[PDB]
Design a binder for this molecule. Structure first.
Ligand SMILES: Cc1cn([C@@H](C)[C@]2(F)CCNC2)c2nc(C(N)=O)cc(Cl)c12
Length: 271
């Protein structure tokens, strides 16, 4: 390609291979993601006939000024793969690596980060998109600005109000009704994953590893965590889907009051 200068490989795995690059016209930092045609779970269609990974359909749906979801800048089709050109914050670290380095997060830091993830998930749902793989590996932190960005819509779907009976996101974030029945609805399955994520932020590891632990849904804390935060987590991890909070109820909960804005968070917590 002559539109982008390719830099180091940043990582590879079920998401494909992702390289650092720069757009040659204006030096903008980008990430260049290659996904093999044989490993794409779902396909969508652009308004015009072109069959594309679902991920491309979903990223176009979520596009706007709103900075909480990674932007798709361009995409290319090759004979055996698709190449996605995405925004790349610089300096950046994903939340998985951040928690690996710092351990359990201070609650004021977790509250700012969790709030920004809820604003990004609400924006996806308002655009008709369900991510289906919310987890710390799929959240990037713009370290200078304190802003978080959701990435990787490769397991996502268009949002619907009937039941889902397929799933290929991350099993330890997936809800008890998926494990037991292979059936879930989108918003309540999303809120269960948010409960897992909030526990991972304030404890430094996820609460469940085994199917039997997910089904029993009993949460224990190894780290000191305030009673209001443990209430929110246990509410989001209610075993009955209809007992979990809506997004409005999460952002109105007492633990979510008084959030730092992203720049304030970067000044206080980010080196
Ligand atoms: C900047 C960046 C880095 N990565 C990956 C190499 C990870 F760091 C690996 C686990 N978290 C993202 C990315 N992955 C994706 C993706 N999976 O869609 C998108 C971006 Cl922007 C990035």
């Amino acid at each position: 390609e002559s539109q982008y200068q390719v830099g180091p490989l940043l990582g590879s795995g079920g998401f494909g291979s992702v390289y650092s690059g720069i757009r040659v016209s204006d030096n903008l930092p980008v990430a260049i993601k290659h996904v093999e045609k044989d490993r794409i779970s779902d396909w969508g269609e652009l308004p015009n006939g072109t069959r594309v990974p679902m991920e491309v359909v979903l990223l176009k749906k979520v596009s706007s000024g709103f900075s909480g979801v990674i932007r798709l800048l361009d995409w290319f089709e090759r004979p055996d793969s698709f190449v996605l050109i995405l925004e790349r914050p610089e300096p950046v670290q994903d939340l998985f690596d951040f928690i690996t380095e710092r351990g359990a997060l201070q609650e004021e830091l977790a509250r700012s980060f969790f709030w920004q993830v809820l604003e990004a998930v609400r924006h996806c749902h308002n655009c008709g998109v369900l991510h289906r793989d919310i987890k710390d590996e799929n959240i990037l932190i713009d370290l200078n600005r304190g802003e978080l960005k959701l990435i990787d819509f490769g397991s996502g779907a268009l949002l619907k109000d009937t039941v889902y009976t397929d799933f290929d996101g991350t099993r330890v974030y997936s809800p008890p009704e998926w494990i037991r029945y292979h059936r879930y609805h989108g918003r309540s399955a999303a809120v269960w994953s948010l409960g897992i994520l909030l526990y991972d932020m304030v404890c430094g590891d996820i609460p469940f590893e085994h199917d039997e632990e997910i089904i029993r849904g009993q949460v224990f804390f190894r780290q000191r965590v305030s009673s209001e935060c443990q209430h929110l987590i246990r509410w989001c991890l209610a075993l009955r889907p209809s007992d979990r909070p809506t997004f409005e109820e999460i952002q109105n909960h007492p633990w979510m009051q008084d959030v730092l804005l992203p720049q304030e968070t970067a000044e206080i917590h980010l080196h």
